[PDB]
Design a protein around this ligand. Structure first.
Ligand SMILES: O=c1[nH]cnc2c1ncn2[C@@H]1O[C@H](CO)[C@@H](O)[C@H]1O
Ligand SMILES: O=c1[nH]cnc2c1ncn2[C@@H]1O[C@H](CO)[C@@H](O)[C@H]1O
Length: 277
């Protein structure tokens, strides 16, 4: 995609009710594919979507076809991902199907079979997806996936899921002394430390040193798990490079390792954190 061609691309518009547009935007907001669009782009994308109904056992797309030039975001229902006759993944409400073929321009990798009495989805055509949504997804996936296969708490994600997490990550560089996370404030970001060291500075206020973390560790999830303001600062001790994830996408991206994060917070290195609770 030429950037100028993406700039001047006029998306189709398919009239729909205010209620349907609102429901679409809620789906686009939590789905990883759209994490970098601003409001006007989200509105345009929603205008280019149209509603599709499937009944149980329908194949939305079939492995090996080349004719499917669309993305589907699931509103209601579930679908099986079937490779070589085996169910290998389950797509639930709010997730998308078809993105791999739109990104990479290959034939349909897997068969997607509705396994609920009905499935209601919203479809998006190849050109709108490529011009308005894709952006630099392919570069983000290729960049981050080298680091993500070495992050301990992400072992519980399969390969497809690690790549999908890359869709919603964004990098930041910090300098010795920079506050990455600041006590008392609202948690919105989960940070993965790709390089450097950081200090967890708690309180009791009393400014008390809690723990030191480094390459491969994560910070910020405690506020996601338990919905409370930051119980501690996180301060760059060296130059730190991070990839971060917005709370929006916490469940969609890390669902399969949310249980590991719970265990981790019940370790002794969270004595400070246990006692505050
Ligand atoms: O390994 C997978 N894990 C999870 N979902 C997959 C996988 N492979 C494919 N899809 C889903 O099936 C669609 C059609 O091939 C893809 O676009 C993707 O949404
Ligand atoms: O007791 C602790 N031990 C280790 N890390 C902690 C502890 N408490 C908080 N954090 C880290 O600091 C962030 C801000 O609250 C938490 O989300 C977590 O990443």
């Amino acid at each position: 995609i030429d950037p100028e061609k993406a700039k001047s691309y006029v998306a189709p518009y398919f009239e729909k009710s205010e209620d349907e547009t609102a429901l679409i935007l809620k789906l686009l907001t939590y789905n990883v594919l759209f994490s970098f669009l601003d409001s006007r782009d989200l509105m345009t994308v929603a205008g280019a979507m149209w509603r599709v109904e499937f009944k149980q056992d329908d194949c939305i797309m079939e492995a090996g076809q080349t004719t499917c030039d669309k993305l589907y975001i699931i509103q209601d229902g579930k679908a099986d991902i079937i490779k070589e006759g085996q169910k290998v993944y389950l797509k639930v409400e709010g997730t998308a199907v078809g993105e791999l073929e739109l990104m990479y321009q290959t034939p349909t990798v897997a068969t997607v079979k509705v396994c609920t009495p009905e499935l209601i989805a919203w479809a998006l055509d190849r050109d709108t997806y490529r011009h308005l949504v894709m952006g630099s997804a392919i570069r983000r996936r290729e960049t981050y996936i080298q680091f993500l296969t070495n992050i301990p708490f992400l072992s519980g994600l399969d390969n497809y899921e690690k790549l999908q997490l890359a869709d919603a990550l964004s990098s930041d560089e910090f300098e010795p002394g920079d506050y990455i996370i600041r006590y008392g404030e609202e948690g919105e970001w989960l940070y993965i430390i790709l390089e450097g060291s950081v200090d967890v500075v708690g309180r009791d206020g009393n400014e008390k040193h809690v723990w030191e973390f480094g390459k491969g560790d994560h910070v910020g999830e405690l506020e996601f798990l338990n919905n409370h303001a930051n119980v501690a600062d996180v301060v760059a001790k060296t130059h730190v490079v991070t990839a971060k994830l917005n709370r929006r996408h916490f469940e969609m991206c890390l669902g399969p390792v949310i249980d590991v994060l719970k265990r981790t917070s019940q370790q002794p290195n969270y004595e400070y954190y246990q006692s505050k609770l």
